[PDB]
C-alpha cells in the first residue's frame, strides 16, 4: 500500500533524473578509498541507497516509517560527518528535498 | 601496553600473509552479501567483521588493548559460524585460520 | 548486429545474476594473484579475463560482435582450466558457469 | 626494462595513494555512464580508461614499456578533458592528479 | 557525562590527526634515556597522555575539573622545564590549542 | 674483533650523544608517528636497541655485519626522509660519531 509507494520514491531517487546530485549515495561511503580514517569512529550506522534497495527486497521495512528512517539516516550521516561548506552536504540537501517532498505526498 | 598491540599487529600481519592465503581469503574483505546472493546475511549478522576492517581499526587506534583486537577477530569467526551450516567450506577455513590465530594470540608475551 | 550484442548483455547479466552466484563469484573480478599467493599466475596465464573486465569492455563497446564477446568469456574459463589442477573447486565452478554460458550463447538468434 | 615498469608501478601506487584521495577518487573506477545518466559518454569517449584498469593491465603485464603505461594514464585524463566542459569540478581534479603523474613520470630513471 | 566528552577529547589528542606534535606526550618523559638528570627535580609531578588514558580507565577522574588539570599539568611541565625556543614547547603549544578548544566546546 | 664494536655501541647509546641519538634508541614506531608508507619503503628496519639485541645474541659473526646494520639504520633514515628534516641532521651527527670511531678500530 504505502510500502508500494515507498518503492516508487526509492526508484525516483535511484532514477537518473537526479543522478547529478544523487550519485554520492548510490553505494556506501568508501572511507578506505576516500582516505577517511575517522568515518566509522563518527558514523555508527552507515546507510546509502543501495542498502535501502537491499532492505526493501528482503521486506525488512514493515512500514514506511522504517524506510523513511534509513533514508533520513543516510542524509543525517552525511550532515553529521561533513562540514556545511562541503559539496556533498549541498547534494544531500537537494536529494533530501526531493525525498521529503515525495514522501509527504504519500496516501 | 603498546607491546601487546605491536604483537597483535604482528598477528594480523601473519593472518593476511602469503602462507595462509588458501584458507584466509574469505576474510580479507567484508562479506559481499549482495554479490553472493545472501538476502538474509545482515539480518542474521548484526556486526560484520573481516581482516580489512581489523587492519583499518588497528591503524586508526580504535583498539585500547589486545583484548579489543581479539574480540574483533573472534567476532569475524563467530559471524562465520553463526551464518553458515557446520559443513560448508567457509566454516572449515575459519577453523584453520582461527587455529592459526588462537595459537599466536596465546603465545603473545 | 547491435541485436546480438544486446543478447550478449543478457548473457552477461544472467552470468552476473544472483541465480548463479554460488559458482559465479570467483569470476566476478580478476584473480588477485598477489593476495592469494600465486607467484606463478601471471607467468602461466598471459591473458587473464573475468566478468567485470567483460562488462567493462561491453559498456565500452569494445566488442565488434558476439564472437568477440564469446572469445573473452571462454578465455576466462580456459585460463581457469589451464592454471588449476582438475580437482579444484574453482574448476567445477567454472564448468557450472560455462554450462550456463554455452547454453544461452548457443540459443541466441 | 621491467625496471622502468617497476617505477610505473610506484607511480600507479602513488596515484592510488591516500595522499591524493580528495582529487584522485573520480578515476579509481571506470566512469559509470548508466548510473550518472551520461547517454553520450560512450559516443564521445571511444576508449575509456581509469586507474583500476591500469592496475589490472599492470598486474596482467600488458604494458611493454613505460611509454605504454603513460599513454593509458594520459588517455584517462584526455578522455576527461574531452567530455567535460573546463569549469566542472572533475576537470580541476584531473589536472591536479595529472600534475602528480607528469612529475613522477618525469623523475624516472 | 561531561567525563564522557573528556574521554572523547583524549581520544582526539591521541588520534593520527595530531601525531606530528602529540608524540612527545604519548609516553612519560624518559628522563634517564634522554640524559635529563634534572627533569625529576624540576618536575615534581610528571604527566603525559598514556597516564591520562590509564587514569580514565580506572575512573580516577571524579569530574572534568580533574581530567583538565592533568592534561594541563602535562603542558605546564613542558613549559616549566624547557627554553621557549625548544621544538617541544611549540608542539605542546599546538596540542594545547587542540585541548583548550575542545574543552571549551564541551556542553554543560 | 667486536669488543671494539660493542664499545662503539655503548658510546652511541650513552648520555653524551642523546640530544641527536634519541630517535635511534628504539625501532621507528610508524603507527604512533602516522607513517602508513614506512614499512613498504623501509624493508629492513634497524635501531640501536636491536643492534644491542643482535650483539648479546652473539649473532654478529665478524665486524662487517655489525657495521652494515648500524649503517642500515642510518641509510633507512636517509632513504625515508627528505634532506632538510631534523632527523637526517641528527642521523648525520651520530654517523659522524660512529664513523670516526669505527675507522679507529684494530
Ligand atoms: C558512492 C559512494 S563512494 O564510492 O564512496 N564515492 C564517493 C565519492 C565522492 C564523495 O564525496 C565527494 C563529493 C560528493 C563531491 C566532491 F566534489 C568530492 C567528494 C570527495 C563521497 C562521499 C559521500 N558521502 C555521503 C559523504 O558523506 C562523503 C564525505 C566525503 C569526504 C571525502 C574526503 C576526501 C574528504 O576529505 C577532503 C580533504 O581530505 C572529506 C572531508 C569528506 O566524501 C563523501 C563518496
Ligand atoms: C572475501 C570476501 S567476498 O568478496 O564476499 N568473497 C567471498 C567469496 C566466497 C565466499 O564463500 C565461499 C567460500 C569461502 C568457498 C566456496 F566454495 C564458496 C563460497 C561461496 C565468501 C564468504 C565468506 N564468509 C566469511 C562467509 O561467512 C560466507 C558465507 C558465504 C555463503 C555464500 C553463499 C553463496 C551461500 O549460498 C550457497 C547456496 O546458496 C552460503 C550458504 C554462504 O560466503 C561466505 C566470500
Ligand atoms: C573474485 C576473484 S578473487 O578476488 O581473486 N577471489 C578469489 C577467491 C577464491 C578463488 O579460488 C577459490 C575458489 C573458487 C574456491 C575455493 F574453495 C578456494 C579458492 C581459493 C579465486 C580463484 C579464482 N580463479 C578464477 C582461479 O582460477 C583461482 C585459482 C586459485 C587458487 C588459489 C590458491 C590459494 C591456490 O593454492 C592452493 C594452496 O596453496 C591455488 C592452487 C589456486 O584461486 C582462484 C579467486
Ligand atoms: C569513480 C567513477 S564513478 O563510479 O563513475 N563515480 C563518479 C562520480 C562523480 C564523477 O564526477 C563528479 C565529480 C568528480 C565531482 C562532482 F561534484 C560531481 C561529479 C559528477 C564522475 C566522473 C568522472 N569523470 C572522469 C568524468 O569525466 C565525469 C563526468 C561526469 C559527469 C557527471 C554528470 C552528472 C554530469 O552532468 C550531466 C548533466 O547533469 C556531467 C556533465 C559530467 O562525471 C564524471 C564519476
Ligand atoms: C615520547 C616521550 S620519550 O620516550 O621520553 N621521548 C622523547 C623524545 C623527544 C623529546 O623531546 C624532543 C622533541 C619533542 C623534539 C626534538 F627535536 C627533540 C627532543 C628531544 C621528549 C621530550 C618530551 N617532553 C614533554 C619534554 O618536555 C622534553 C624535554 C626534552 C629535552 C630533551 C633533551 C635531550 C634536551 O637537551 C638536553 C641538552 O643536551 C632538552 C633540553 C629537553 O625532551 C622532551 C621525549
Ligand atoms: C625512537 C623511536 S620512536 O619511538 O618512533 N620515536 C621517534 C620520535 C621522533 C622521531 O622523529 C622526529 C624527530 C627526531 C624530531 C621531531 F621534531 C619530530 C619527529 C617526528 C622519530 C623518527 C626516527 N627516525 C629514525 C626517522 O627516520 C623518523 C622519521 C620520522 C618522521 C615523523 C613524522 C611525523 C614525519 O612527518 C610526516 C608528515 O607530517 C616525517 C616525515 C618523518 O620520525 C622519525 C622517532
UniProtKB/Swiss-Prot annotation, chain A:
It is found in: Nucleus; Chromosome. It comes from the Eukaryota. Changing residue 36 to A: Reduced binding to histone H4 acetylated at 'Lys-12' (H4K12ac). Changing residue 29 to A: Abolished binding to histone H4 acetylated at 'Lys-12' (H4K12ac). Residues 1-106 form the Bromo domain. Homodimer. Interacts with E2F1. Interacts with (acetylated) STAT3; promoting STAT3 recruitment to chromatin. Interacts with CTCF; promoting BRD2 recruitment to chromatin. (Microbial infection) Interacts with herpes virus 8 protein LANA1. The first bromo domain specifically recognizes histone H4 acetylated at 'Lys-12' (H4K12ac). It also specifically binds histone H4 acetyl-methylated at 'Lys-5' and 'Lys-12' (H4K5acme and H4K12acme, respectively). The second bromo domain recognizes and binds histone H4 acetylated at 'Lys-5' and 'Lys-12' (H4K5ac and H4K12ac, respectively). Belongs to the BET family. Some specific inhibitors of BRD2 that prevent binding to acetylated histone are promising therapeutic molecules for the treatment of cancers or inflammatory diseases. ABBV-744, a small molecule, has been tested on tumors with success: ABBV-744 antiproliferative activity is mainly restricted to cell lines of acute myeloid leukaemia and prostate cancer and is able to displace BRD4 from chromatin. GSK046 (iBET-BD2), which specifically inhibits the second bromo domain, is a promising therapeutic small molecule for the treatment of inflammatory and autoimmune diseases. Chromatin reader protein that specifically recognizes and binds histone H4 acetylated at 'Lys-5' and 'Lys-12' (H4K5ac and H4K12ac, respectively), thereby controlling gene expression and remodeling chromatin structures. Recruits transcription factors and coactivators to target gene sites, and activates RNA polymerase II machinery for transcriptional elongation. This is Bromodomain-containing protein 2.
UniProtKB/Swiss-Prot annotation, chain F:
Residues 1-105 form the Bromo domain. Changing residue 33 to A: Reduced binding to histone H4 acetylated at 'Lys-12' (H4K12ac). Coiled coil: none annotated. It is found in: Nucleus; Chromosome. Transmembrane segments: none annotated. Signal peptide: none annotated. Some specific inhibitors of BRD2 that prevent binding to acetylated histone are promising therapeutic molecules for the treatment of cancers or inflammatory diseases. ABBV-744, a small molecule, has been tested on tumors with success: ABBV-744 antiproliferative activity is mainly restricted to cell lines of acute myeloid leukaemia and prostate cancer and is able to displace BRD4 from chromatin. GSK046 (iBET-BD2), which specifically inhibits the second bromo domain, is a promising therapeutic small molecule for the treatment of inflammatory and autoimmune diseases. The first bromo domain specifically recognizes histone H4 acetylated at 'Lys-12' (H4K12ac). It also specifically binds histone H4 acetyl-methylated at 'Lys-5' and 'Lys-12' (H4K5acme and H4K12acme, respectively). The second bromo domain recognizes and binds histone H4 acetylated at 'Lys-5' and 'Lys-12' (H4K5ac and H4K12ac, respectively). Homodimer. Interacts with E2F1. Interacts with (acetylated) STAT3; promoting STAT3 recruitment to chromatin. Interacts with CTCF; promoting BRD2 recruitment to chromatin. (Microbial infection) Interacts with herpes virus 8 protein LANA1. Belongs to the BET family. Chromatin reader protein that specifically recognizes and binds histone H4 acetylated at 'Lys-5' and 'Lys-12' (H4K5ac and H4K12ac, respectively), thereby controlling gene expression and remodeling chromatin structures. Recruits transcription factors and coactivators to target gene sites, and activates RNA polymerase II machinery for transcriptional elongation. This is Bromodomain-containing protein 2. The lineage of its organism: Eukaryota, Metazoa, Chordata, Craniata, Vertebrata. The gene is BRD2. The chain holds residues 349 to 454 of 801 of the full protein.
Amino acid at each position: 500500500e504505502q510500502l508500494k509507494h515507498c518503492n516508487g520514491i526509492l526508484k525516483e531517487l535511484l532514477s537518473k533524473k537526479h543522478a547529478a546530485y544523487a550519485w554520492p549515495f548510490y553505494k556506501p561511503v568508501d572511507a578506505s578509498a576516500l582516505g577517511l580514517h575517522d568515518y566509522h569512529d563518527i558514523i555508527k550506522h552507515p546507510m546509502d541507497l543501495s542498502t535501502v534497495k537491499r532492505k526493501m527486497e528482503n521486506r525488512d521495512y514493515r512500514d514506511a516509517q522504517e524506510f523513511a528512517a534509513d533514508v533520513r539516516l543516510m542524509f543525517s550521516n552525511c550532515y553529521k560527518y561533513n562540514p556545511p561548506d562541503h559539496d556533498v552536504v549541498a547534494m544531500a540537501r537537494k536529494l533530501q528535498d526531493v525525498f521529503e517532498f515525495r514522501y509527504a505526498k504519500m496516501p
